[PDB]
């Protein structure tokens, strides 16, 4: 299960809603394994190219808003230093990007509430106003 999850996220090299929704299901199927996906999805935001950093955040951000917890709680902990980092790796396109997924994140419009609990969130709104 692993293996695979890992695979096809090696392939998520362009905003394929089929690979994300594939991933999310995974994810959703097997809590067991939860942190494992979440160690593979951090290991792929932080090891791939700058222009496809974006792609993986997406899936995290599907698993987390259509799986829950305890997704939300595993990915809390490494959110802030993954997006920080992203963030100052690619271009502004891609900022914007980034800064309307965390928009959402604050307000999911919504079930309405921070749909990361934790210092996550205020630490990334703070980066973001100094940045
Ligand atoms: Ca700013």
Redesign the pocket.
């Known amino acids: 299960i692993v293996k695979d999850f890992n695979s096809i996220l090696e392939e998520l090299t362009f905003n394929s809603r089929p690979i994300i929704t594939t991933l999310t299901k995974l994810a959703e199927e097997n809590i067991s394994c939860a942190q494992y996906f979440v160690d593979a999805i951090e290991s792929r935001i932080e090891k791939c190219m700058p222009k496809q950093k974006l792609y993986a955040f997406y899936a995290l951000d599907s698993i987390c808003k259509n799986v829950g917890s305890p997704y939300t709680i595993y990915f809390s902990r490494n959110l802030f230093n993954l997006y920080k980092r992203t963030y100052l790796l690619v271009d502004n396109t891609t900022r914007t990007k980034l800064?309307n997924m965390f928009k959402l994140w604050l307000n999911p419009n919504d079930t309405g509430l921070p749909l990361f609990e934790g210092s996550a969130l205020e630490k990334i709104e703070q980066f973001?106003?100094?940045?």
Do not use: D, F, P
């Open positions: 800064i973001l106003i100094k940045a």
